[PDB]
Amino acid sequence: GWSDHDELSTDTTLHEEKFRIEPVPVHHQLDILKIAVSENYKTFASVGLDRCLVVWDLRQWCTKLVLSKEQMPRTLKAIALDPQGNYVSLFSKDTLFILNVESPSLMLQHSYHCKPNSKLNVFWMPGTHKDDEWKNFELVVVESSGEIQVFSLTIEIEGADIALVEKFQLSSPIIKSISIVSPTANRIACLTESGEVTVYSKKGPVWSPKILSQNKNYLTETKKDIYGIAMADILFLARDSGVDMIDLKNDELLHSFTLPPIKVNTFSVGVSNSRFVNGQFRVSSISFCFTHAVTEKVLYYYYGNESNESYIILNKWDQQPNLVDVHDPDNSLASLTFDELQENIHEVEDASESVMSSDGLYIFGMRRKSSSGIS
Amino acid sequence: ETQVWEVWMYSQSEKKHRSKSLKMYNSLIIADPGPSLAVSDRCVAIVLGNYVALVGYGSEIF
Amino acid sequence: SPLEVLASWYAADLLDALLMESLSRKVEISEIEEIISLCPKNSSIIRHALLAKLVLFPENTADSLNEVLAAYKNTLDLCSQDSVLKINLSKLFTLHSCLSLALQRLGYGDVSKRMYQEIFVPDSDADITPLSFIISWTALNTFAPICTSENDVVEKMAMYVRTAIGTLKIQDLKLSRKLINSCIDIGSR
Amino acid sequence: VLSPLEVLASWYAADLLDALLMESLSRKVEISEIEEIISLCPKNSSIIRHALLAKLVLFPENTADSLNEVLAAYKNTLDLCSQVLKINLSKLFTLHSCLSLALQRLGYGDVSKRMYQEIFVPDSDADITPLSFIISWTALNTFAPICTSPKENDVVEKMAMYVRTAIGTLKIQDLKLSRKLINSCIDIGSR
């Protein structure tokens, strides 16, 4: 956000000292449309209203790539990125581009099926792996039609190779769906506008859909939105009656955290300190973004205790008694039954546009109280 | 345009609120902030016209 | 006249203020006819005032279009009979759009679309009178749905308003956002 | 910015084009001759458009397909004009009436007549080229039986006094053409 000179009040706290804010001088000719991001955080990509492409490195702060509009097709319905962030994909309505950034070359171009002008949604899925020496990808292509494409895309430095594999054709138009890759296995969630929550899952060659059990007590509800943590492979599920936190694979409903009714297209979750001790996937703290349904104030409920007060036995890796002997510093921390999680209120004006941190630890955001001309 | 922007924060770990002013003289940007997306656990990027705000704390990025 | 110059000035400022109120409030012909009579016989702002009338009032386009084309058939007669034209691209695009909008409102939209398709839209600059803004805005809106069957104009014209505003928002930032969004669905076409 | 080879190509083309317009008046004309012209005209010049406007008028079934290029060249001559216009009265009138003619040949009638009735016919100066004449002749022809009906505000009278002063320069041929123009004056006075 350029200005002839930005300024902020001089800090009196180390709490604000490390707190910082910087521009990237590089820019689109015109205002932003939509963007996507690598899990590595090192990579970033962006597109404007002029639909120029730009990609940039976060830590090394050096230019990576730029593309003017006239280098590009008139239609650009969609965009997608590999989890590594080492490569880029774009969906013009008739044909997709696949380009490297770290090694700018035309890795591939390929025509693909479409049913305009139904809204797109898209998901990358890493293969048996071997980067950089050899690679593969599984291109999910979710559609408002409820069709869900999936494609093979083995790729090597020699030049990207491509072949189609399957066409899911799910019932009914869809609200939402998302990829969820457990380190053990690929899984993919699929909410319906019907409110059905199917999940395809990759048992290697097997690609099995399964009917997750939203249970009888509130089946009728229009959903707000499901959201989960794919690294946790855990399914949170919005309802005004109380969100689900359903288990995957072996699959079960667990518990429903007590909540105020919440606006649609708002729900999301974040957690501090990823780790995978003793097969368990505990985290230090959990937090909960959503706009409110009525008051429409931004809301971020917190749970967990910490810094040493608690450890989160979210789920259990095996819902069974266990006695494996390796060091468990968390055992020194107090066990958390759902009862003591105790949400921490902090209702705030909608006018302050803001987001919860991905670890959920911190709030951040801004708004313009006022602005004026050069005069 | 000159712009009296309002930075602020509220830590959950500290249960604590603070804020900062953010002047923007002669900005050509007109748009409201968003869509937003955290660029890390400690840092976030946000749309502001064609330009993108980047903010962080304790970040190695700075 | 040396006077009619100053009368043309006041009618100028009185029109630039009347066009910006046409976005927040519902405005009525009585305010325009005040500007027209306040103006002089054959001045500069007398032509722009009639354009405003042709744009801001669809219920009065046929009678209005006549008054515009008569004031232009008049400006021309007293140019040769007393002879080279002085038009810039922004005022070309201004008359261009204002006609197509006036002809969509007259049912010939079977033609008015194909005319709107070939409009050369200026770039981003400081020069942008509120007359040309109101026309470019109300023409973008009146052609945001019909034009999809080229489609470049809606997106280019919406970008002109978004990046070619120059006046304070007033239930208009939501309207400019509506322009950008309609342009987005145009991108989504 | 034109070399020295294409300037002569344009002069040669402009004389052949003028020749084809006046020849089209007392002989039967075709496009086969215009293809040779436009190709002979250098690739980005005023003579292109004059060759096109002649093709628009002289070939009426090809109106739809020759109007395409007339707009293409003008939208392209505008394209580089920024990446200020200065048009002449007779240039406006020529394009004005030539579009009116092209629209009637399409099936607009109403739209064709109203544009025709708002044509601003130039007074009577030296700006008389066989193209401007050929257009005004054929446009007077295809419109005199339509705009002559409603009576009140028309240019039919002004248009015919233009073609009067048109025919009469260096053609020096061939009496019967002048006799035909006399038949035109007879057509106007008897109207």
Side-chain angles (χ1 to χ4, degrees), chain A residues 1-38 40-70 72-129 132-375, chain B, chain C residues 1-40 42-113 115-149 151-168 187, chain D residues 1-42 44-85 87-90 92-151 154-170 189:
Chain A
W2 175 251
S3 66
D4 292 346
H5 58 77
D6 289 343
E7 62 180 341
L8 279 67
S9 295
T10 59
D11 292 342
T12 59
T13 59
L14 60 81
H15 301 290
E16 293 177 350
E17 181 180 2
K18 291 189 296 184
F19 180 82
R20 295 293 302 281
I21 180 170
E22 299 306 321
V24 295
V26 176
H27 59 77
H28 297 291
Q29 298 296 101
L30 295 173
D31 290 345
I32 299 168
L33 186 26
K34 181 59 167 60
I35 62 171
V37 55
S38 64
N40 62 35
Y41 300 99
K42 181 183 64 61
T43 300
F44 177 80
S46 63
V47 172
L49 294 174
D50 55 354
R51 295 196 299 273
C52 55
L53 187 146
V54 174
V55 297
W56 176 260
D57 185 2
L58 280 309
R59 295 293 182 88
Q60 295 177 336
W61 289 91
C62 55
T63 60
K64 288 161 60 181
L65 188 146
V66 175
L67 294 174
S68 62
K69 182 176 180 290
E70 294 79 356
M72 299 304 294
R74 177 174 66 87
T75 60
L76 294 173
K77 292 181 69 67
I79 182 170
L81 274 65
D82 58 355
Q84 293 301 320
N86 299 134
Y87 294 92
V88 177
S89 62
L90 293 173
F91 294 162
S92 64
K93 63 182 179 181
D94 61 9
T95 298
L96 60 84
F97 294 166
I98 305 300
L99 294 173
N100 189 341
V101 173
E102 183 179 3
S103 296
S105 63
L106 192 148
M107 291 301 295
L108 189 144
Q109 183 176 354
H110 190 277
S111 296
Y112 65 88
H113 298 289
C114 295
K115 269 70 179 180
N117 289 337
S118 178
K119 176 63 183 295
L120 296 176
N121 192 29
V122 177
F123 295 96
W124 286 90
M125 294 174 72
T128 188
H129 187 40
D132 181 68
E133 183 178 2
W134 54 273
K135 296 182 177 74
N136 189 339
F137 293 107
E138 297 175 351
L139 293 176
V140 175
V141 177
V142 176
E143 297 175 351
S144 295
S145 64
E147 182 178 1
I148 295 170
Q149 298 174 336
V150 292
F151 294 158
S152 178
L153 182 64
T154 299
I155 291 172
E156 293 179 350
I157 301 98
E158 291 81 356
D161 296 345
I162 188 166
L164 188 148
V165 292
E166 297 303 321
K167 183 189 291 180
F168 298 156
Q169 184 60 61
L170 276 65
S171 298
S172 179
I174 292 169
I175 294 168
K176 184 67 180 296
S177 65
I178 57 173
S179 63
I180 296 169
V181 176
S182 65
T184 300
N186 289 339
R187 293 175 178 81
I188 57 102
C190 296
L191 174 63
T192 61
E193 295 177 352
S194 297
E196 294 175 349
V197 58
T198 60
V199 169
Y200 286 87
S201 296
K202 182 181 172 61
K203 181 66 181 296
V206 177
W207 291 94
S208 64
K210 292 176 179 177
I211 305 301
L212 290 50
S213 297
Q214 60 175 20
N215 192 341
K216 296 171 296 300
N217 285 283
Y218 301 96
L219 293 172
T220 59
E221 298 181 354
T222 60
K223 304 295 176 63
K224 302 297 177 64
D225 188 4
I226 63 172
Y227 173 80
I229 297 169
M231 67 196 87
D233 188 4
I234 290 171
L235 187 145
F236 295 96
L237 185 148
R239 291 196 305 277
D240 290 344
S241 63
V243 296
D244 286 345
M245 179 176 69
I246 295 171
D247 178 64
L248 278 309
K249 180 182 166 59
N250 291 283
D251 180 66
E252 185 178 2
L253 187 27
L254 293 53
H255 184 278
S256 295
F257 303 152
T258 299
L259 297 173
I262 293 168
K263 182 181 170 62
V264 64
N265 302 132
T266 60
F267 173 74
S268 64
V269 177
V271 297
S272 62
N273 290 338
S274 296
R275 64 181 179 275
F276 192 79
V277 174
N278 194 341
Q280 294 178 336
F281 183 78
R282 293 180 181 172
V283 298
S284 297
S285 66
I286 300 171
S287 295
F288 298 92
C289 178
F290 61 91
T291 301
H292 190 277
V294 174
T295 62
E296 297 177 353
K297 300 293 184 291
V298 178
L299 297 174
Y300 300 142
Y301 288 138
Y302 172 75
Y303 295 94
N305 297 337
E306 195 178 1
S307 178
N308 60 346
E309 294 177 350
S310 68
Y311 67 93
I312 297 169
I313 298 170
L314 57 84
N315 194 31
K316 290 195 294 184
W317 174 256
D318 291 341
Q319 296 302 324
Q320 63 182 20
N322 187 340
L323 295 174
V324 175
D325 182 66
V326 298
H327 186 278
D328 183 69
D330 287 345
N331 65 34
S332 295
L333 292 48
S335 178
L336 292 175
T337 60
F338 299 98
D339 293 345
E340 62 185 341
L341 297 176
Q342 296 172 336
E343 62 184 342
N344 293 336
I345 297 169
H346 182 62
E347 184 176 2
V348 294
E349 64 182 342
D350 187 3
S352 295
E353 186 68 12
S354 65
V355 66
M356 177 179 73
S357 64
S358 62
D359 60 11
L361 296 177
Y362 296 136
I363 298 169
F364 296 100
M366 289 176 69
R367 62 180 295 273
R368 70 170 67 198
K369 291 189 295 184
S370 64
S371 63
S372 64
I374 292 171
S375 178
Chain B
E1 63 178 342
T2 306
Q3 294 177 339
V4 181
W5 289 100
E6 183 182 2
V7 182
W8 62 268
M9 66 168 282
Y10 181 80
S11 177
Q12 298 297 101
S13 63
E14 296 177 350
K15 292 179 178 179
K16 176 70 181 298
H17 178 63
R18 286 189 299 273
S19 62
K20 293 179 179 179
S21 177
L22 188 145
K23 185 187 69 64
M24 283 184 66
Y25 177 78
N26 195 32
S27 179
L28 289 57
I29 302 170
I30 302 170
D32 290 347
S36 64
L37 181 61
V39 69
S40 65
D41 289 343
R42 293 183 181 176
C43 183
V44 178
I46 297 169
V47 176
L48 274 71
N50 57 342
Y51 294 93
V52 54
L54 275 66
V55 182
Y57 172 80
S59 178
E60 296 177 350
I61 305 167
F62 300 98
Chain C
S1 177
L3 214 69
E4 287 173 278
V5 175
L6 302 153
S8 199
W9 182 349
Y10 184 87
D13 290 345
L14 241 189
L15 186 59
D16 299 332
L18 184 52
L19 292 148
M20 295 320 203
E21 292 176 325
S22 83
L23 300 164
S24 35
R25 89 160 162 262
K26 290 205 134 151
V27 60
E28 59 206 356
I29 296 199
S30 177
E31 278 143 304
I32 296 276
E33 300 157 333
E34 284 182 18
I35 314 300
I36 288 176
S37 65
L38 203 289
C39 256
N42 299 300
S43 49
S44 195
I45 297 97
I46 194 61
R47 298 146 31 192
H48 292 63
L50 289 181
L51 292 183
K53 205 202 242 169
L54 177 73
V55 153
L56 291 170
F57 302 99
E59 100 274 2
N60 208 322
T61 38
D63 279 30
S64 184
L65 195 273
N66 312 330
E67 309 181 79
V68 178
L69 263 303
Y72 277 133
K73 173 190 218 111
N74 175 275
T75 295
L76 281 187
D77 158 50
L78 310 171
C79 174
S80 78
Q81 194 213 279
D82 317 321
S83 82
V84 177
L85 293 179
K86 279 147 220 292
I87 295 176
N88 82 302
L89 215 169
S90 86
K91 208 43 69 184
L92 172 129
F93 154 83
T94 295
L95 305 147
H96 202 347
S97 312
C98 195
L99 184 59
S100 319
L101 164 62
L103 292 168
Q104 170 260 345
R105 298 167 166 177
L106 297 178
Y108 310 103
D110 42 71
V111 195
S112 168
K113 201 182 69 142
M115 172 174 291
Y116 180 74
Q117 308 199 121
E118 300 195 64
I119 296 189
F120 193 64
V121 287
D123 266 357
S124 166
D125 321 79
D127 230 15
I128 58 121
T129 170
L131 183 270
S132 68
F133 163 62
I134 290 293
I135 304 174
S136 160
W137 171 240
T138 60
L140 185 282
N141 284 345
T142 40
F143 282 102
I146 314 93
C147 186
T148 39
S149 84
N151 198 39
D152 209 32
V153 194
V154 197
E155 313 180 65
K156 266 174 163 228
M157 187 158 298
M159 263 280 118
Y160 185 45
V161 178
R162 172 68 156 91
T163 166
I165 304 298
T167 58
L168 300 180
Chain D
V1 175
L2 344 69
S3 38
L5 168 75
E6 297 176 298
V7 178
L8 310 172
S10 79
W11 291 351
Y12 190 18
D15 277 6
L16 296 163
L17 182 269
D18 290 336
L20 184 41
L21 291 156
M22 308 307 304
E23 278 189 331
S24 66
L25 167 57
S26 319
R27 147 187 135 213
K28 248 321 177 181
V29 210
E30 335 127 295
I31 325 93
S32 71
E33 273 174 309
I34 313 286
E35 170 210 347
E36 200 184 37
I37 312 185
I38 318 164
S39 64
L40 242 190
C41 326
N44 218 66
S45 36
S46 66
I47 301 86
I48 298 299
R49 301 100 144 277
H50 297 42
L52 292 167
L53 290 157
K55 187 154 82 71
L56 176 52
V57 170
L58 302 164
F59 313 98
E61 311 121 291
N62 222 281
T63 46
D65 288 275
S66 40
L67 214 177
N68 286 6
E69 299 118 20
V70 171
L71 285 57
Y74 269 93
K75 292 301 146 190
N76 180 25
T77 206
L78 291 185
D79 198 314
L80 310 176
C81 194
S82 48
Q83 289 176 337
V84 199
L85 299 168
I87 297 184
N88 186 280
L89 285 175
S90 50
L92 183 145
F93 150 89
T94 282
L95 286 154
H96 207 320
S97 37
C98 207
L99 185 58
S100 304
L101 211 181
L103 291 189
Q104 176 267 355
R105 292 182 169 157
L106 273 204
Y108 297 123
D110 306 323
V111 198
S112 312
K113 293 185 261 168
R114 189 41 167 118
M115 189 180 292
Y116 193 86
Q117 278 166 334
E118 213 56 54
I119 297 175
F120 171 70
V121 49
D123 45 80
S124 75
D125 252 10
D127 305 45
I128 302 286
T129 78
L131 166 60
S132 77
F133 152 70
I134 281 306
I135 297 192
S136 38
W137 179 223
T138 45
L140 201 182
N141 265 8
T142 65
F143 275 98
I146 323 170
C147 327
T148 72
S149 168
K151 274 326 319 274
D154 255 24
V155 182
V156 271
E157 165 190 310
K158 267 104 208 251
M159 208 93 158
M161 304 183 185
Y162 183 88
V163 288
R164 188 204 81 99
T165 71
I167 34 97
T169 52
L170 293 174

